[PDB]
RNA sequence: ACCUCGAUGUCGACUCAUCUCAUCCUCGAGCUGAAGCAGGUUCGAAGGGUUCGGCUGUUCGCCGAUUAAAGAGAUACGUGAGUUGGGUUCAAACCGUCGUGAGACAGGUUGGUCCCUAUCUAUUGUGCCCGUAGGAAGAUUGAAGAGUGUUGCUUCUAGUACGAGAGGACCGAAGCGAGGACACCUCUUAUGCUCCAGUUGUAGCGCCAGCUGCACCGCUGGGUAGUAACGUGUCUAUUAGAUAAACGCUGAAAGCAUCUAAGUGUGAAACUAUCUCAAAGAUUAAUCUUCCCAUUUCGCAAGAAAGUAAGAGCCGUCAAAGACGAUGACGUUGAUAGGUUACAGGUGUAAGCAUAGUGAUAUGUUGAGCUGAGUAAUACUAAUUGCUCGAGGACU
RNA sequence: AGCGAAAUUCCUAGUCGGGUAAAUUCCGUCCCGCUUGAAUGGUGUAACCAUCUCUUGACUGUCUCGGCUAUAGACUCGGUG
């Protein structure tokens, strides 16, 4: 439908208080120092030191 | 004469309880609602009513709080 | 609504899966979507464990599952798989390919993955 | 499964071709013509050489179900057609000699005459 | 945590029959029904062509197509049904587990068998 | 049993009572037993 | 009281032949021997219930607080713990079996968790009915209809609470009353339950002594075949 | 002619049904000019249920066909931000009539007439945060309660009671169980478009066998786990308390009778329940237990700094969850999941190798070929070397 | 003359048969004619209406009774919004 009365600006801010994403993971890479994500590849090209990607 | 009649937002189970039936299941909400019947709808209404700790026995859980032993308060 | 972009239809999905498995057989590794990468790994493992016989029967059967690409066509991918890809990894019970998770996409932040062939 | 006005077959010497369900009698609002229950049907096509003609409302006992139901016995209760016997307003059909398999679930309400009027019981 | 998904057949093995085949449906089988009649206890056979071959244990069903008194009957008979004896009679030349070209034949004829 | 707004002797012996705040006439014969008097 | 409870994991649905040469719909549930973590009285923790611990597994992913709970109640590490409501039996540290809790074919009540379907509307939850849609059906084609209760303040000016609107279907515990027990198998610690009981291929099942037909028993046990190859 | 025309969307239907019970039934008895087998009235009773269609368009109104029951009404003569315009009647036209006419009939008919991205609230589930009253950790007495809370059929009983006599059973027991709610995919099926097996070709893999992109899954058949009914399985009933209508016993008033007035009772699906339950955001923020520490030291105590030494979470193979998050099994330590063996289950004796059939096709290769969802073993792979939340018992 | 409740007629849900299991809507016919009725035509129209009133069959999910498979999606993530 459509709204009768406008949702407030502060009501909008309070409603949008839970649109943000959830927390993420952190992982230490032993060979190439970086705080990457869990079961992801770092910018150094390695998932947990398996050289599986290029430099970029 | 005085039964106890209640109807929340739920429908189809309108609660009508006799005096002897109240003694079988629950008795604290009796005095709870009786006292809250003298409380205006405000911020501390349901906060004022919790100060009326309704018990069916002579003891209470707040004996460690130094209760004033008296009668008819 | 009515007629518009078809999208990911079942026929299109299976054709894309065939194209991706042919691409991972030709180029070796493929950077694609994680859900597509895992299906491609599954099909590649099935093809590797099917091609250990190296007979015309598997040629005809896999003929319905490979789609030609830039480098390799269907019957050249046949010989490629039957010669080097399948026998190289048959020494182990499974694990003919590995999928690893990558970062998101620039414009659409799509979680991607990389699929490689290994023992 | 047979439902309201789901035309079903007649397999006895009655003089009618097709019968359509009008209601189900027995318990309250059965709404499904299963084996073991007598139903009321209407005839929209009937030869004038029998004792029943077009336009009348008769009764039938369904004895064969094409899709059928999962019978408690162990084998899926299944026939080759949704077949019934157009009865003469009782447990017995209008035919003097009954041909074809007869439902074994009819015993919950009777209908023993359909079985006893035939040499075999399937 | 731990899963087995093998007890599905185990519940059925306590009284599983030893026949329990897995073949190409389309054969001709006769199944007998022991009618414990008051007089002349009867063994009423129920013969017909197989149509579908399904079953995950004691639920190994198969459809038998008979015709009695001009009325046909396709019964989804269970192999392990008590008071039911099941035997396999004819193994015809069949390339499927669901055929219908055997159902469009006429009388006074015969079918070829597998070579 | 019944419903009325006044109860009077109906039969030869139809006594008038006040049962559950309801004035009634009840006879030794079960016929003449009304309510709501 | 009369409430005797057993737990298990449903490995799916099957079939088997019961007495009188009749087949019954069979849900197959594996049962692990239980051990009671507590008997809570109406004056102990204010509730009458029996907390049983089952599914003995490795302690790598368990709670050390739960481990000590087991120890001070003389138990072993278990994956699952559950309180049956309205009971005072099952003395602490007892390995219970369904043989002493039920009969082979007695009437019981079985609770089970439905297969997860996510947020499925009330039409598939409460099994509404739809009439004929011939000669036009409007812009939509599926809806549960009206919840009208007053417009303005005349009768309700609201929607009656408990209205059957779109929600969650599946993964909701359901109790079927007075169903007979098909078969036990203490060699493999397995149970067969009659009817079409809830549970995915991996769901859980609780069996309790019936409260309307506790002692009523009729045979649906395993039926020997009169013709075995 | 009023709150309402600087509008207050209505007829009817489908669905959702709820409610008061001046009751249809069930449940219960009285009264009975009730002969019995069954019951006429009455109330208690909202607790549940309380027909399908052809036809005026439609439930309803005619007719046919149903059970113990197919309710007395409101919810804007319920419904329309859930649906429809069905006909009067739209924009057009006809038919009989009228008006010389625009046109009209408290006349009939066809063409043909309804928007909603839900802000809150009402409401169904899942959430983040915090409190969750030491962290974590399991479970609930409970606060506002709702749903099944409906119930028949068959047989014996028994030709005995009741009538008198034909008549003639409820009563007692048993099974089947119909709406409603509940769920399952086990049998069956529909599907299963990552399975197999046939199929007409375009067009091809240079060609042909085999198939290929495609042709409504290209066609349709069976079909993995399946999902759902096209199917299965349940239950209501009964009951405890107190009552109602009802029947009362002593028994007064009224020295006697006599349900209430003091005593002594039953009684219904009606109230709580009894069949099913669980919720402390119940801020009424709760109780118990457990692992941990409480290591001398610092908010209108977060027991400060060593804020774990205990636990959980992040994330992945995934679903057991699930709108999405969350939640949960397993995490190189492993069967938690993917792939391999066997394959479960299913398709259904692949193909050529040579022959038979002249040929479609088949045969030693064959229950092999295969299984996408799935199964027991299988590190072969994935789940990380990993990181985060995370205690000194708050306040009494 | 002819006509009929006929797109039509308060009485009228006309009536008879048929259609329809079921018929006020429909056909033929008798016709309670505010009101038929003769080129505002009475009136059958074989053929047919991109209109209609009703019945029905091969045939189908329109339905008794809906269900699964794939999706553009919606739910989620990202860009604009």
Short mmCIF file of N, CA and C (backbone and C1' of nucleotides) in Angstrom, two decimals, chain H residues 266-316:
data_model
loop_
_atom_site.label_atom_id
_atom_site.label_comp_id
_atom_site.label_asym_id
_atom_site.label_seq_id
_atom_site.Cartn_x
_atom_site.Cartn_y
_atom_site.Cartn_z
P U H 266 -20.92 -33.63 43.97
"O5'" U H 266 -21.70 -34.28 42.74
"C5'" U H 266 -21.72 -35.69 42.56
"C4'" U H 266 -22.66 -36.09 41.45
"C3'" U H 266 -22.45 -35.38 40.13
"O3'" U H 266 -21.43 -35.97 39.35
"C1'" U H 266 -24.75 -35.33 40.69
P G H 267 -20.38 -35.06 38.53
"O5'" G H 267 -21.24 -34.49 37.32
"C5'" G H 267 -21.95 -35.36 36.45
"C4'" G H 267 -23.04 -34.61 35.72
"C3'" G H 267 -22.64 -33.26 35.16
"O3'" G H 267 -21.99 -33.35 33.90
"C1'" G H 267 -24.63 -33.02 36.39
P A H 268 -20.39 -33.21 33.81
"O5'" A H 268 -20.11 -33.29 32.24
"C5'" A H 268 -21.01 -33.96 31.38
"C4'" A H 268 -21.51 -33.04 30.30
"C3'" A H 268 -20.57 -31.92 29.90
"O3'" A H 268 -19.53 -32.34 29.04
"C1'" A H 268 -22.76 -31.07 30.15
P A H 269 -18.11 -32.78 29.66
"O5'" A H 269 -17.05 -32.19 28.63
"C5'" A H 269 -17.09 -30.82 28.26
"C4'" A H 269 -16.71 -30.64 26.81
"C3'" A H 269 -16.87 -29.23 26.25
"O3'" A H 269 -15.81 -28.37 26.58
"C1'" A H 269 -17.77 -30.81 24.73
P A H 270 -16.06 -27.08 27.52
"O5'" A H 270 -17.62 -26.77 27.38
"C5'" A H 270 -18.11 -25.95 26.33
"C4'" A H 270 -18.97 -24.81 26.84
"C3'" A H 270 -18.35 -23.96 27.95
"O3'" A H 270 -17.47 -22.97 27.46
"C1'" A H 270 -20.54 -24.57 28.57
P C H 271 -16.07 -22.68 28.20
"O5'" C H 271 -16.46 -21.75 29.43
"C5'" C H 271 -15.75 -20.55 29.70
"C4'" C H 271 -14.98 -20.63 31.00
"C3'" C H 271 -13.72 -21.48 30.98
"O3'" C H 271 -12.60 -20.80 30.45
"C1'" C H 271 -15.01 -22.02 32.89
P U H 272 -11.39 -21.62 29.80
"O5'" U H 272 -10.63 -22.24 31.05
"C5'" U H 272 -9.98 -21.41 32.01
"C4'" U H 272 -9.42 -22.21 33.15
"C3'" U H 272 -8.56 -23.41 32.76
"O3'" U H 272 -7.23 -23.05 32.43
"C1'" U H 272 -10.12 -24.06 34.41
P A H 273 -6.66 -23.34 30.96
"O5'" A H 273 -5.68 -24.58 31.17
"C5'" A H 273 -6.03 -25.88 30.71
"C4'" A H 273 -6.40 -26.78 31.86
"C3'" A H 273 -6.30 -28.28 31.59
"O3'" A H 273 -4.98 -28.77 31.71
"C1'" A H 273 -8.36 -27.80 32.65
P U H 274 -4.37 -29.74 30.59
"O5'" U H 274 -5.25 -31.07 30.72
"C5'" U H 274 -5.28 -31.80 31.93
"C4'" U H 274 -6.30 -32.91 31.86
"C3'" U H 274 -6.30 -33.73 30.58
"O3'" U H 274 -5.29 -34.71 30.55
"C1'" U H 274 -8.51 -33.11 31.11
P C H 275 -4.21 -34.70 29.37
"O5'" C H 275 -5.08 -34.97 28.05
"C5'" C H 275 -4.96 -36.18 27.33
"C4'" C H 275 -4.73 -35.92 25.86
"C3'" C H 275 -3.63 -34.92 25.54
"O3'" C H 275 -2.34 -35.51 25.56
"C1'" C H 275 -5.56 -34.36 24.31
P U H 276 -1.09 -34.71 26.19
"O5'" U H 276 -0.88 -33.50 25.18
"C5'" U H 276 -0.35 -33.72 23.88
"C4'" U H 276 -0.06 -32.43 23.17
"C3'" U H 276 0.62 -31.35 23.99
"O3'" U H 276 2.02 -31.55 24.14
"C1'" U H 276 -1.15 -30.40 22.75
P C H 277 2.63 -31.96 25.57
"O5'" C H 277 2.96 -30.57 26.27
"C5'" C H 277 4.09 -29.81 25.89
"C4'" C H 277 3.69 -28.61 25.06
"C3'" C H 277 4.03 -27.25 25.65
"O3'" C H 277 5.37 -26.86 25.40
"C1'" C H 277 1.79 -27.26 24.86
P A H 278 6.56 -27.37 26.35
"O5'" A H 278 7.68 -26.25 26.18
"C5'" A H 278 7.82 -25.53 24.96
"C4'" A H 278 7.46 -24.08 25.13
"C3'" A H 278 8.06 -23.41 26.36
"O3'" A H 278 9.38 -22.94 26.13
"C1'" A H 278 5.74 -22.99 26.32
P A H 279 10.25 -22.37 27.36
"O5'" A H 279 9.88 -20.83 27.42
"C5'" A H 279 10.12 -19.97 26.31
"C4'" A H 279 9.26 -18.73 26.37
"C3'" A H 279 9.21 -18.04 27.72
"O3'" A H 279 10.32 -17.19 27.94
"C1'" A H 279 7.01 -18.29 26.88
P A H 280 11.05 -17.19 29.37
"O5'" A H 280 10.36 -15.99 30.15
"C5'" A H 280 10.13 -14.74 29.51
"C4'" A H 280 10.62 -13.58 30.35
"C3'" A H 280 12.13 -13.46 30.48
"O3'" A H 280 12.48 -12.09 30.63
"C1'" A H 280 11.18 -13.76 32.62
P G H 281 13.55 -11.41 29.64
"O5'" G H 281 12.97 -9.95 29.42
"C5'" G H 281 11.86 -9.49 30.17
"C4'" G H 281 10.90 -8.72 29.29
"C3'" G H 281 10.04 -9.56 28.37
"O3'" G H 281 8.85 -10.02 29.00
"C1'" G H 281 11.12 -7.89 27.11
P A H 282 7.95 -11.17 28.33
"O5'" A H 282 7.03 -11.68 29.53
"C5'" A H 282 5.84 -10.98 29.89
"C4'" A H 282 5.90 -10.43 31.29
"C3'" A H 282 7.24 -9.81 31.70
"O3'" A H 282 7.01 -8.69 32.55
"C1'" A H 282 6.67 -11.54 33.20
P U H 283 7.20 -7.20 31.99
"O5'" U H 283 8.78 -6.99 31.95
"C5'" U H 283 9.61 -7.46 33.01
"C4'" U H 283 10.22 -6.33 33.79
"C3'" U H 283 9.47 -5.00 33.72
"O3'" U H 283 9.52 -4.35 34.98
"C1'" U H 283 11.69 -4.71 32.96
P U H 284 8.23 -4.38 35.93
"O5'" U H 284 8.23 -5.84 36.56
"C5'" U H 284 9.22 -6.23 37.50
"C4'" U H 284 9.04 -7.65 37.98
"C3'" U H 284 9.59 -8.73 37.04
"O3'" U H 284 10.08 -9.82 37.81
"C1'" U H 284 7.28 -9.08 37.39
P A H 285 11.64 -9.90 38.19
"O5'" A H 285 12.39 -9.85 36.78
"C5'" A H 285 12.33 -10.96 35.89
"C4'" A H 285 13.20 -10.75 34.68
"C3'" A H 285 14.68 -10.56 34.94
"O3'" A H 285 15.37 -11.78 35.18
"C1'" A H 285 13.95 -8.92 33.42
P A H 286 16.63 -11.80 36.18
"O5'" A H 286 16.14 -12.69 37.40
"C5'" A H 286 15.13 -12.23 38.29
"C4'" A H 286 14.20 -13.34 38.69
"C3'" A H 286 14.87 -14.68 38.98
"O3'" A H 286 15.35 -14.76 40.31
"C1'" A H 286 13.04 -15.01 37.52
P U H 287 16.80 -15.38 40.61
"O5'" U H 287 16.51 -16.93 40.85
"C5'" U H 287 15.52 -17.35 41.78
"C4'" U H 287 15.25 -18.83 41.65
"C3'" U H 287 16.50 -19.69 41.48
"O3'" U H 287 17.07 -20.04 42.72
"C1'" U H 287 14.94 -20.23 39.78
P C H 288 18.66 -20.18 42.88
"O5'" C H 288 18.96 -21.65 42.34
"C5'" C H 288 18.19 -22.76 42.78
"C4'" C H 288 18.45 -23.97 41.92
"C3'" C H 288 19.90 -24.17 41.51
"O3'" C H 288 20.66 -24.80 42.52
"C1'" C H 288 18.49 -24.44 39.63
P U H 289 22.19 -24.39 42.78
"O5'" U H 289 23.01 -25.39 41.86
"C5'" U H 289 22.60 -26.75 41.73
"C4'" U H 289 23.03 -27.31 40.40
"C3'" U H 289 24.42 -26.91 39.94
"O3'" U H 289 25.43 -27.70 40.54
"C1'" U H 289 22.88 -26.65 38.16
P U H 290 26.84 -27.06 40.92
"O5'" U H 290 27.76 -27.41 39.67
"C5'" U H 290 27.57 -28.62 38.96
"C4'" U H 290 27.90 -28.45 37.50
"C3'" U H 290 29.18 -27.70 37.20
"O3'" U H 290 30.33 -28.52 37.29
"C1'" U H 290 27.43 -26.85 35.85
P C H 291 31.68 -27.95 37.94
"O5'" C H 291 32.42 -27.25 36.72
"C5'" C H 291 32.97 -28.02 35.66
"C4'" C H 291 33.67 -27.14 34.66
"C3'" C H 291 34.47 -25.99 35.26
"O3'" C H 291 35.76 -26.39 35.70
"C1'" C H 291 33.12 -25.17 33.51
P C H 292 36.41 -25.73 37.01
"O5'" C H 292 36.78 -24.25 36.55
"C5'" C H 292 37.62 -24.03 35.42
"C4'" C H 292 37.57 -22.59 34.99
"C3'" C H 292 37.76 -21.57 36.10
"O3'" C H 292 39.12 -21.36 36.43
"C1'" C H 292 35.89 -20.96 34.79
P C H 293 39.72 -21.96 37.79
"O5'" C H 293 40.39 -20.69 38.48
"C5'" C H 293 41.18 -19.79 37.72
"C4'" C H 293 40.54 -18.43 37.64
"C3'" C H 293 40.43 -17.67 38.96
"O3'" C H 293 41.64 -17.06 39.35
"C1'" C H 293 38.37 -17.54 37.80
P A H 294 42.03 -16.99 40.91
"O5'" A H 294 41.02 -15.93 41.52
"C5'" A H 294 40.93 -14.62 40.99
"C4'" A H 294 39.68 -13.91 41.45
"C3'" A H 294 39.42 -13.95 42.94
"O3'" A H 294 40.17 -12.98 43.66
"C1'" A H 294 37.45 -14.54 41.80
P U H 295 41.40 -13.45 44.58
"O5'" U H 295 42.67 -13.38 43.63
"C5'" U H 295 43.81 -14.20 43.87
"C4'" U H 295 45.06 -13.68 43.22
"C3'" U H 295 45.10 -12.19 42.88
"O3'" U H 295 45.43 -11.39 44.00
"C1'" U H 295 45.98 -13.47 41.08
P U H 296 44.32 -10.95 45.07
"O5'" U H 296 44.95 -9.68 45.80
"C5'" U H 296 44.43 -9.22 47.04
"C4'" U H 296 45.14 -7.96 47.50
"C3'" U H 296 45.30 -6.87 46.45
"O3'" U H 296 44.14 -6.08 46.31
"C1'" U H 296 47.36 -7.22 47.55
P U H 297 43.06 -6.40 45.17
"O5'" U H 297 42.64 -4.97 44.62
"C5'" U H 297 42.39 -3.89 45.52
"C4'" U H 297 43.24 -2.69 45.19
"C3'" U H 297 43.05 -2.11 43.79
"O3'" U H 297 41.94 -1.24 43.70
"C1'" U H 297 45.36 -2.37 44.25
P C H 298 40.48 -1.82 43.34
"O5'" C H 298 39.77 -0.63 42.56
"C5'" C H 298 39.16 0.45 43.25
"C4'" C H 298 39.53 1.78 42.66
"C3'" C H 298 39.13 2.00 41.20
"O3'" C H 298 37.78 2.40 41.06
"C1'" C H 298 41.39 2.64 41.51
P G H 299 36.70 1.42 40.38
"O5'" G H 299 35.86 2.36 39.41
"C5'" G H 299 34.65 2.97 39.85
"C4'" G H 299 34.22 4.08 38.92
"C3'" G H 299 32.93 4.79 39.29
"O3'" G H 299 33.11 5.77 40.30
"C1'" G H 299 32.89 4.26 36.99
P C H 300 32.38 5.61 41.73
"O5'" C H 300 30.82 5.55 41.36
"C5'" C H 300 30.12 6.72 40.98
"C4'" C H 300 28.64 6.59 41.26
"C3'" C H 300 27.88 5.62 40.38
"O3'" C H 300 28.03 4.27 40.78
"C1'" C H 300 26.67 7.64 40.54
P A H 301 28.07 3.10 39.68
"O5'" A H 301 28.40 1.78 40.52
"C5'" A H 301 29.73 1.51 40.96
"C4'" A H 301 30.40 0.50 40.07
"C3'" A H 301 29.70 -0.86 39.99
"O3'" A H 301 29.89 -1.41 38.68
"C1'" A H 301 31.89 -1.15 40.82
P A H 302 28.67 -1.42 37.63
"O5'" A H 302 29.39 -1.54 36.22
"C5'" A H 302 28.97 -2.50 35.26
"C4'" A H 302 30.15 -3.22 34.65
"C3'" A H 302 31.06 -3.94 35.64
"O3'" A H 302 30.57 -5.21 36.02
"C1'" A H 302 32.37 -2.65 34.16
P G H 303 30.64 -5.67 37.56
"O5'" G H 303 32.06 -5.14 38.05
"C5'" G H 303 32.47 -5.30 39.41
"C4'" G H 303 33.89 -4.86 39.62
"C3'" G H 303 34.92 -5.58 38.74
"O3'" G H 303 36.02 -4.70 38.49
"C1'" G H 303 35.38 -6.02 41.01
P A H 304 35.89 -3.51 37.42
"O5'" A H 304 37.38 -2.97 37.24
"C5'" A H 304 37.66 -1.58 37.19
"C4'" A H 304 39.14 -1.30 37.31
"C3'" A H 304 39.98 -1.73 36.12
"O3'" A H 304 40.05 -0.75 35.10
"C1'" A H 304 40.89 -2.67 38.07
P A H 305 40.51 -1.15 33.61
"O5'" A H 305 42.06 -1.50 33.77
"C5'" A H 305 42.56 -2.77 33.38
"C4'" A H 305 43.98 -2.97 33.86
"C3'" A H 305 44.64 -4.27 33.43
"O3'" A H 305 45.15 -4.22 32.11
"C1'" A H 305 45.01 -3.92 35.74
P A H 306 44.86 -5.43 31.09
"O5'" A H 306 45.68 -6.64 31.71
"C5'" A H 306 45.21 -7.98 31.60
"C4'" A H 306 46.26 -8.98 32.00
"C3'" A H 306 45.78 -10.41 32.20
"O3'" A H 306 45.66 -11.12 30.98
"C1'" A H 306 47.16 -9.78 34.01
P G H 307 44.28 -11.12 30.16
"O5'" G H 307 43.23 -10.47 31.16
"C5'" G H 307 42.16 -9.66 30.67
"C4'" G H 307 40.81 -10.23 31.03
"C3'" G H 307 39.82 -10.31 29.88
"O3'" G H 307 38.99 -11.47 30.04
"C1'" G H 307 38.93 -8.93 31.59
P U H 308 38.81 -12.50 28.83
"O5'" U H 308 39.53 -13.83 29.34
"C5'" U H 308 40.91 -13.81 29.72
"C4'" U H 308 41.31 -15.09 30.40
"C3'" U H 308 41.42 -16.31 29.49
"O3'" U H 308 42.45 -17.17 29.98
"C1'" U H 308 39.79 -16.71 31.15
P A H 309 43.76 -17.47 29.08
"O5'" A H 309 43.92 -19.05 29.15
"C5'" A H 309 42.78 -19.90 29.03
"C4'" A H 309 42.75 -20.94 30.12
"C3'" A H 309 41.35 -21.37 30.57
"O3'" A H 309 41.35 -22.76 30.89
"C1'" A H 309 42.54 -20.49 32.41
P A H 310 40.77 -23.82 29.85
"O5'" A H 310 39.19 -23.59 29.91
"C5'" A H 310 38.41 -24.19 30.93
"C4'" A H 310 36.96 -23.80 30.83
"C3'" A H 310 36.37 -23.73 29.43
"O3'" A H 310 36.06 -25.00 28.89
"C1'" A H 310 35.69 -21.84 30.67
P G H 311 36.15 -25.24 27.30
"O5'" G H 311 34.86 -24.51 26.72
"C5'" G H 311 33.55 -24.97 27.03
"C4'" G H 311 32.52 -23.88 26.85
"C3'" G H 311 32.30 -23.40 25.43
"O3'" G H 311 31.46 -24.25 24.67
"C1'" G H 311 32.56 -21.54 26.83
P A H 312 31.76 -24.51 23.11
"O5'" A H 312 31.02 -23.31 22.37
"C5'" A H 312 29.64 -23.06 22.57
"C4'" A H 312 29.30 -21.61 22.36
"C3'" A H 312 29.52 -21.08 20.95
"O3'" A H 312 28.44 -21.36 20.07
"C1'" A H 312 30.56 -19.63 22.48
P G H 313 28.73 -21.72 18.53
"O5'" G H 313 28.96 -20.30 17.84
"C5'" G H 313 27.99 -19.27 17.95
"C4'" G H 313 28.60 -17.91 17.70
"C3'" G H 313 29.21 -17.69 16.32
"O3'" G H 313 28.24 -17.33 15.35
"C1'" G H 313 30.74 -16.98 17.97
P C H 314 28.44 -17.76 13.81
"O5'" C H 314 29.68 -16.88 13.32
"C5'" C H 314 29.60 -15.46 13.28
"C4'" C H 314 30.87 -14.87 12.71
"C3'" C H 314 31.28 -15.41 11.35
"O3'" C H 314 30.61 -14.74 10.29
"C1'" C H 314 33.15 -15.44 12.80
P C H 315 29.60 -15.55 9.33
"O5'" C H 315 30.56 -16.29 8.30
"C5'" C H 315 31.58 -15.59 7.62
"C4'" C H 315 32.69 -16.53 7.19
"C3'" C H 315 32.23 -17.82 6.54
"O3'" C H 315 31.95 -17.66 5.16
"C1'" C H 315 33.84 -18.30 8.20
P G H 316 30.79 -18.52 4.45
"O5'" G H 316 31.50 -19.89 4.07
"C5'" G H 316 32.63 -19.90 3.20
"C4'" G H 316 33.34 -21.23 3.26
"C3'" G H 316 32.47 -22.45 3.01
"O3'" G H 316 32.31 -22.72 1.63
"C1'" G H 316 33.81 -22.79 4.94
#
